[PDB]
Symmetry: C4
Subunit: 331 residues, 4 copies
C-alpha cells in the first residue's frame, strides 16, 4: 500500500472540497433569467430558491426567517434560547404571512418538549440538529418525531459525512438529510478532534444513499461563494444551508461593528465558547456587513442562474446531473 | 469511486493549467533567431506572429489593431460601442495600409446588423464573441455568417472549454475555434458561477476536435508570461489571444494612472460592472504600464523563439508536437 | 516509471503527514465524557492518558514528570545533564508519590553507567534515545538493557521511520517502539540531511511491524493540535510524545520571555547549537506561554475524547481501527 | 486520457524536484565522521568532496577555484571574459599548488581557440557550457575536443534534462554529463520560454542513460540546502554544482553590499541582462554574505555526512542506491 501499512481501506477515500472542482460547461439552450431554481427542501416541501439559513444565533431569528421565506428560501430558527422564546419566534414568522419556517431541536431530555412546543406554534420543519447524526439517540429522535407529528411536519436529520450515516437516517424516516461534518467557516472540529470530511465527496456519498429513496440532501457548511452553491447542487444536493454568507446581512441578529473604518458583524460557531456560555469546536469571528438580505440572495441566485446557463440545466434536477473537472493547486 | 459516489464520470477529468506543465527540451538544430513563428489564425489567414489582442475596451481599438497588424499579429476590435463607431475604427485600420483587422459581434438582434456593417467597412475576420459557444443561437450565428459572407470573410467562434463544443462549432462552419471559459486574469466566473476549465486541458480537448478538420485553435485567456504562449501552442493551439499582457501598453485605450509613484493603466473585464454600464463575471483592475506595443511583442516573441530553440521546433506546426512534463506544487 | 528512471522502488512510497488526513466519523454510541482514554505506553505499563512529554531540556525535568504522572500520563527526563543529577530527578519524582517516571539514555560509553544509575534511582522506563535506532549499537543497547534489568524496567527504543527498523527493535527486545525521524517542530534534519519520513505513513509502517508482536508504538514529533493526537492513535500508535505542545507550560524548565507584550518560553531542539554546547539538526525557538500543564492536558484530552465520540471508539484500541479520508491542498 | 486529448505521451512524465522527496533512513553502521565523501567528477577525476562551483562571474574566478580545490572540490572558471584573462586565471590556480581546475567554453567560433588556450594554460577539465546540449554543434564540440586533447584533459558536456540528450553526449564521448535545464535559483527560463525539467526526475533520467556507460552525472542548479546535495546524489548524481550556495562567500567575486543593516553580495544569471552586457533568461539578485568558503563547505559536507549516516551509506556509491519517499504539499 503506497501510503503505508498493508490495509488498503485504512485510507478509505480521497476527499474533495468545493475548491477542488469546477463545473464543466455543456450544451445549452438555457438563459439564466428563465432557469427554474426551485428545489426540494424535503420530500414534500419545495422552495423557490434552494437556500436555507443556518440555525445559529448570529444568523437566524424571526427577522431572518421572514426575509428568507419572502426571498423564496427558508430560515431555520436556532435553539440557543428558551423553548417559549423559540416558539414565540415561530409564531412571529407565521403572523407575517403564510411563510415557511423551520426550527432546530436537539436530542436531549427537553428536546422532545421543545419539539412539541414548536409543533403547537405551527412550525413547518423540525431540524434535528447535531454534529453527528449516526447515533442511536439521534436516529431514535428522528423516528419518534416522524411517527408522532410526521403527517403535518417534515423532519430533517443531520449532520452526516458518510454514506452509511445518510442511509441510517433514511431508514429512520428522515424527510431530508443534512450533510456537513467539519466544513463550516467557523469550525475547528478538524483541528480539535482531527475529524472531518471534505464537502464535495461527502455530498456525493450522501446522495448515493439518499437519492434512490427520494430523500433530498441539504449541503451544510463551507460555502464561500455563489459558485459553491452551484457546485454543491451539481454534486447532487437539493438545497444549501448558509451561515457565513448570510451572517453579514441587516436581518441577522447582532449590531454593526466598526473596525479600522470598516463595517462588520459578529459571526460565531454554536460550538464556540461564547455560544456555549469545556472543549470548543467553533470560533467567534467577524464577517463584513453586506446590507439587505434580499440583495445578498439576489446575488447568490444570480450566480446559480449563470451556472445553470453554462451547464444547460433548465432545472435544479438537471444541474444535479452536471459534471466536474478536478483542478490542481495551481488552478 | 475514490473521490465519492458510484459514478466514475461525475468527475470527468483532471484539468491542467499553464503552471501545471513545462515544455521538455528535445533534440534541436533550431536557432531562436531563425525559427519560423508564422501560424494560422484561421483556415485561410496566416499571421507572421501567432498573437491576437483581446476584444476588450481596455485593450483593442484602432490604435492597438494597427500596431498589432504592423507587429505581424492582429487585433480584434471590441464591440462595447455603437455599430457606426466600430465600423469607423475598421475603416481607420484599413486606411493605414493593407492591414489585417478583426471585430467582435454578439448573437443578439443587432448582432446581424453589426456584422453587415463591419463587412461593408472591410473587416477581414468576424469573431462571434460569447462566453459559451455551445448554444444553438451562437452556432446558428456562426453558420449564417459563414453561408452569407464566408467567401470574403473568415468567421471565428468561441469560447469553448470542451471537445463537444469545439466539434459543434466546426460542424457549424467555424474557420477557427477560440478556447477559454473562465481562465482570464480578470475573470470571476469560477467563483461566481463555479464554472470553468483549466486551459491546457481545455486546449488539448479542443484541438482533438478541431485539428482533424483543419480548424485552428485560438488559446484565449490566462496567459501571464511569454512562456505560457509556448505552452499554449505546444498543447496544439495555433494562436493565442492576449488581454492583460497587452493592456499595459501605450497603444491600448485609457490614460496612465499614478499609484504610489508607479505607472499603471486600467484593465477591466467585459463582464465587469463598469463595462456593462446585474451579476458581474469580471473585475475592474490595473496593470503596470509597459511602454510601446512593439517592444512588448518583441519580448513575448523572443520567449517563444527560445522555446522553439529548446524544443527543436523549426515551425509552429512542429512546436505543436512538443511534449510536456507535469510538475507538482513544489515546482 | 512516470517520475523518472527505470526503477519503481527508487521512490518507495507516498508519505502522508497529519495534515494530509482527517478521521472519518462512524456509527457511535460513545459519549466523549465516558470514553476510555487509557492505553499501553509499553507491553506492561498502561497510562490513563496516552500522552508522554519529550526528553528535552526545555520540556521535561522533575516538575514536568510529576505533573504529567499526576495528569495520568508520564514524563521522560532528558539526559543533557550529569548522571547524578538525572538520577536525583528520578528520586525526586518517586519522592512525590507512587508516580511513573521514564528517563533517556544514549548508546555511548557512559550510557550503560547512566542506565544503571537510573535503575538504582527507581526509574520505571528507560528510553534508549537516538535519531536513528536502526543501528547495531542501538539494537545491542536495547537488548543488553532488556536482558539485564528487563524484569523490573521497561525498555523503549527509538526513533524509527520504517517497517524494517521497527521490526529490528522488536527482535532486539523493545517493550515499545518510538516513531519519528524528522517530523519535530524544531527539527532541521529534513533540510540539513535531506532525510525524513512523514509521520502518518511512518506510524502505519511501524505499527505493521510492531502490532503483530504486541509491541506499542509511541508517535513522537510533529503533533501541533489535539486533533493530531487522535490521528496518530488512529494510525495505530498507542501513545504520543509531545514537545512543542507542552514546552509552553508553567511546569516546563525555563523562565518567561516577554516579546512585543506577549508571553513566551524558549523551546529548543536537542540537536540545536545551544543544546549541544558541529552540524546542528534542530533550532532554538519560542512557544507561547500556555499556563498550567493540567489545563493544557485537559484540552488535548478533550479533543481526543471528541474524536472518540465522532468515530464511535469506546477505547483507544477501537480508535486504532478508525479510517481516514485523504485530503488535498485545498482542504 | 484523464488530463486531456487522446495522446498519453503528450504529458510524458511527472517531474519531481528536490522538495518533492525525502531520503528514507536505512540500516546503518556508518558514522558521519567516518563516511567516505569522495566521488567521480569525471571518468578519471575523483574529488574528495563531491562539490563543484558554478561557471558564473559572480561565483568562480581564481580565488574561488583555489579555495574549492583546497577544500577537496573543484571550481569551474567562468567564460564571460577575454580568453587571455581566463587562461591567466588557470595559470594562477596552477601556480598555487597541484590544484585541480576546470574552465567553461562555448561552441561558437572562438570557442575552439579558447579551449586550446586553456589547454596550454594547464587546465584539467573543459566544460562545454550551454543551456541545451542536445544539439549537433554542442555534440560536435564535445567530440572534437575529446579526440584532440582527450588524453590529457577531461571533457564535460551539458546541460541536459532528458535521457536521450544524456545518451547523445555519452555517444559523443563526454567524460561527464551535467544536468539542469531551468532549475537555477536565478533562472527565468521556465517563465520566459516555458521550458524546464524538475531536477530529481531529470537526474534519474540522465543517470539511466549515463551510469550503464560509466559516465558520472553532475547535478547542476536548484540546490538550496545541504540536504538537496544528499538528495541529488541519492538520485544517482556523482557530484553537484553550486551557484547560489557559494555566491555569498568571501572567495566569490564582487564586493559586500549593505542593505537594511545586513550584508549581501550580488549573484546574477549568466543569461541576465547585466551579464550579457535581447531576451534574458536569468535575473540579477543578492544573496546573504556567508563568510569564508571553507566554513560553508564544512557545513554542506556535514549535512551530507549526516545523510550518509542515516541511510547507511559508507560511500557516495552506496548513497546512490538509497531510496526516497515522495511527500505532499502539506509536508
Ligand atoms: O456535543 C458535541 C461534541 C460531540 C458531538 C458528536 C460526537 C463527538 C463529540 N458538540 C456539539 C455541537 N458541535 S458544533 O456546534 O460545533 C456543530 C453544530 C452543527 C454542525 C456541526 C458540524 N460539524 C462540526 C460541528 C458542528 C460541536 C460538538
Ligand atoms: O451573458 C453572460 C452570462 C451567461 C453567459 C453564457 C451562459 C451562462 C451565463 N455573460 C456575458 C459575457 N461574459 S464575460 O464578459 O465575462 C466573457 C467574455 C469573453 C470570454 C469569457 C470567457 N469566460 C467567462 C466569461 C467571458 C460573462 C457572462
Ligand atoms: O548524532 C546525530 C547525527 C547522526 C544521527 C543518526 C545517524 C545520522 C547522523 N544526531 C544526534 C541527535 N539528533 S536530534 O537531537 O536532532 C534528534 C533527537 C531525537 C529524535 C530525532 C528525530 N529526528 C531527527 C533528530 C532527532 C540529531 C542528529
Ligand atoms: O543562447 C541562449 C538561448 C538558447 C539556448 C538553447 C536553445 C534555446 C535558446 N541562452 C544562453 C545561455 N542561457 S543561460 O545563461 O541562462 C544558462 C546557462 C547555463 C545553464 C542553463 C540551464 N538552464 C537554463 C539556462 C542556462 C540562456 C539561454
Ligand atoms: O461551532 C461550530 N463548529 C463547527 N460547525 C458549526 C458550528 N456552528 C455551526 N456549525 C455548522 O457550520 C454551518 C455554517 O457554515 P458556514 O456557512 O461555512 O459558515 C452551520 O450551518 C453548522 O452546520
Ligand atoms: O469580464 C470578463 N469575465 C471573464 N472573462 C473575460 C472577461 N472579459 C474578457 N474575458 C476573456 O479573458 C480574455 C483575456 O484574459 P487575460 O489575457 O488573462 O487577461 C479575454 O480575451 C476574454 O476571453
Ligand atoms: O534537535 C532536534 N532535531 C530534530 N528532532 C528533535 C530535536 N530535539 C528533539 N527532537 C525530537 O522532536 C520531538 C518533539 O517534536 P515536537 O512535539 O513537534 O516539537 C521530540 O520528542 C524529539 O523526538
Ligand atoms: O542566467 C541564467 N539562467 C538560467 N540558468 C543559469 C543562468 N546562469 C547560470 N545558470 C545555471 O544555474 C546554475 C546554478 O544554480 P543555483 O545554484 O540554483 O543558483 C548554474 O551552474 C547554471 O547551470
Amino acid at each position: 500500500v503506497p501510503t503505508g501499512g498493508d490495509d488498503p481501506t485504512k485510507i478509505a477515500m480521497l476527499g474533495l472540497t468545493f475548491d477542488d472542482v469546477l463545473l464543466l460547461p455543456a450544451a445549452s439552450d438555457v438563459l439564466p433569467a428563465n432557469a427554474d431554481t426551485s428545489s426540494q427542501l424535503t420530500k414534500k416541501i419545495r422552495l423557490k430558491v434552494p437556500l436555507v439559513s443556518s440555525a445559529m444565533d448570529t444568523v437566524t431569528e424571526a427577522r431572518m426567517a421572514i426575509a428568507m421565506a419572502r426571498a423564496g428560501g427558508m430560515g431555520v430558527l436556532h435553539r440557543n434560547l428558551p423553548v417559549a422564546e423559540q416558539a414565540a419566534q415561530v409564531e412571529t414568522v407565521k403572523r407575517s404571512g403564510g411563510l415557511l419556517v423551520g426550527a432546530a431541536v436537539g436530542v436531549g431530555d427537553d428536546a422532545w418538549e421543545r419539539a412539541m412546543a414548536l409543533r403547537d406554534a405551527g412550525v413547518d420543519v423540525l431540524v434535528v440538529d447535531t454534529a453527528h447524526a449516526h447515533n442511536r439517540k439521534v436516529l431514535d429522535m428522528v423516528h419518534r418525531l416522524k411517527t408522532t407529528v410526521g403527517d403535518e411536519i417534515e423532519v430533517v436529520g443531520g449532520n452526516v459525512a458518510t454514506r452509511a450515516a445518510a442511509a441510517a437516517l433514511v431508514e429512520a424516516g428522515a424527510d431530508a438529510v443534512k450533510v456537513g461534518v467539519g466544513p463550516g467557516s467557523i469550525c475547528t472540529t478538524r483541528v480539535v478532534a482531527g475529524v472531518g470530511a471534505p464537502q464535495i465527496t461527502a455530498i456525493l456519498e450522501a446522495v448515493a444513499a439518499c437519492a434512490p429513496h427520494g430523500v433530498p440532501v441539504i449541503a451544510d457548511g463551507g460555502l464561500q461563494y455563489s459558485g459553491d452553491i452551484a457546485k454543491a447542487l451539481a454534486a447532487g444536493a437539493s438545497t444549501a444551508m448558509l451561515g457565513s454568507l448570510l451572517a453579514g446581512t441587516a436581518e441577522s441578529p447582532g449590531e454593526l461593528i466598526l473596525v479600522n473604518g470598516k463595517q462588520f458583524k459578529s459571526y460565531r460557531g454554536m460550538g464556540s465558547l461564547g455560544a456555549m456560555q469545556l472543549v470548543p469546536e467553533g470560533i467567534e469571528g467577524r464577517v463584513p456587513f453586506r446590507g439587505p438580505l434580499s440583495t445578498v440572495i439576489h446575488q447568490l441566485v444570480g450566480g446559480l442562474r449563470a451556472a445553470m446557463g453554462y451547464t444547460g440545466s433548465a432545472t435544479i434536477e438537471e444541474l444535479q446531473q452536471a459534471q466536474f473537472v478536478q483542478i490542481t493547486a495551481a488552478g
